[model samples]
Target: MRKIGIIGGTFDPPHYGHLLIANEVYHALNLEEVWFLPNQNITSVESRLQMLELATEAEEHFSICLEELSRKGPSYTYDTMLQLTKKYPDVQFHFIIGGDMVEYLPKWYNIEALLDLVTFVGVARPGYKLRTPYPITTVEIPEFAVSSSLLRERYKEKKTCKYLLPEKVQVYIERNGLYE
Candidate 1:
């Protein structure tokens, strides 16, 4: 089966940590291609628009779907998975999630169906403690604990988080007053 992975996140601003996770997951899982799904609506379109505007000037892969950002109302992995399955029936889907969020996986919309539909790939986060005993295989990606919330706090304090995020994303956040 063709193995394709989806890395979904609020990506309030895409960061280096996310990139590392993606790269590691791709290598670790032997995925053919990994798509980044940035949360469009959860964090608003500011970052999305900025990302597009800076794509040429920037050097990274943000062409992946901003489905979460573009979708109306709340964005859920199950919904996105269903859409992907219908879009590409032949390709096997692997959904990447943070270890912290895995605990809440059972609460996700259509959790059982989602599990049946695709594989869940969980990467480690700083503070998330796992609670559920899921049967599906999960990959624990070693990651730095930095988060958008913490990054924002650093920004709020006027401390530099320049390395915490992608240069383009940091520029966009600084210019747009996001998290201010």
Candidate 2:
């Protein structure tokens, strides 16, 4: 069975940290490939998809997934997993999420079914504690002090935080007049 890692997020601007975490988790867990599932609620799915494409172009194992974007209403992890499992029944999915999300598991839709469909891999971030006792395989990675919200704020303030975003995505954002 193929071992796939699912990294789901808003990816408002597809920053360096997201790529770093995906890469680290890929190696740490021996994943065949990592799919970046961008949420449709935040930025335009087209822009987010384009940024993800530009950001992960060099990583052969990284790819963009619009499963959540194609779905209507809230993008629930359980719902996404159901579609993925039906599509690739032979693939074992390792869902990569922030350590902070552990506490929110109980609030997720069909939590039990979601757990059965995939393994939850907690990617540790600074200042976030694992409050839930969920059976999550935690991967400790160096804290990269960056976030989509922070990037948006910097852009609003006209601060050019170069390298925080991939060069191609940075160019795309600037040219498209995004997050202003």
Candidate 3:
């Protein structure tokens, strides 16, 4: 009964860049919900989920899925999506990724078979070219241009990264002393 967009990542610290793209895709594809699937973690799944929860609180269509955290091995979308489709037979899922990730789609685990289970959606800067063999719906989202690695570096160096993230996320990072 649901058409969901799956945005999977470590979300080491979910910032505006992540939320912005997901929001744009949600509206662009007319999805009923966009699940923030935090794939295996470094700063702790509890912390990641909390920060994601706080960051997405204002959006009624936003939600989080914890499927990847339960595994002890590396997180893979094919496995996760396969499980989800079986559990929610009535639900349709769209796997969302950036154009950069799209370029490497062929390298993903069981790429060919996985394509039959869900739709792929890629979004990147207007100038980026996404090449893939399988079907992928490209979406044009504004570029704020920040990465989790960049934010992690800023935190490690004690530099300011104001407004690039949601206020609650910034505050959460501060309160937890993460990446320090």
Candidate 4:
């Protein structure tokens, strides 16, 4: 079976920390590829999509999918997974989620169906405690405290988050005058 990981997020600016977690999961799980799914809710979808494209440009196993963005209404993982499974019936999906999201998993729409559809990968986040008894695979990643909100705040303050984000994404944000 072909194992593919999906890392879904708002990706307001597509930071390096996001890349780190996806890359770690990809190698750790021996995934065929890791698809970065940017939420279509907040920020400009165009900007987020462009940033993701630039961020994963040089990565052979990294890709951007508009599965969530193309769908109308809220971009929920359950819905995205449903569509993906139908479209790529031969692929096994691993949904990459943060440690903080474990508690809220039960509250997700069609939670039971979602659980049955894909394997979940819980990644450790900085300062966030992982709750045990989670029905998902847990992986320990190096603590990194990078957030899109922080990056946006810094950008609004005219500060550079050069190293925090990928070089191409940083350039795209600046060139397009995003978050300012």
TM-score per candidate, chains pooled = 0.78, 0.91, 0.93, 0.91
Instruction: Give the per-residue lDDT of model 4 (tens digit) for 30-108.
Output: 9999999877624777778888888898999999988888877776678889999999998999999888778788888
Considering TM-score, which of the candidate structures 3 and 4 is the better prediction for this target? 3
Residue lDDT tens for model 1, 1-180: 778878766565656776777777778788887777766413456565565345323424323765665577777777878887888898898887777777788788889998888988887644544557775545666667777678767877889986777777777777877776
Question: Looking at candidate 4, what is the lDDT of residue 84?
Answer: 95
Q: List where candidate 4 sits over 4 angstroms from the true fold.
A: 41-43, 125-134
lDDT of 3 by residue, 6-47 (tens): 998778888888889889999999999999988762598789
Q: By TM-score, how accurate is candidate 3?
A: 0.93
- Whole-structure CA lDDT of model 4: 0.86
Best by lDDT: 3
Q: lDDT of candidate 2 vs native?
A: 0.86
What lDDT is reached at residue 6 by model 1? 83
Taking the tens digit of each residue's C-alpha lDDT, what string does model 2 give over 46-164?
Answer: 78888889999998899888788787767778888999999999999999887767878888899988999999998776455566667888888878879998998898899987979
**What is the C-alpha local distance difference test score of each model?**
0.70, 0.86, 0.87, 0.86
Q: In candidate 4, residue 46 scores what lDDT?
A: 79
**Which candidate number would show the highest TM-score if scored against the true structure?**
3
The RMSD of every model to the true structure, in order and in angstroms, is 3.8, 2.3, 1.7, 2.3
Off by over 4 Å in 2: 125-131
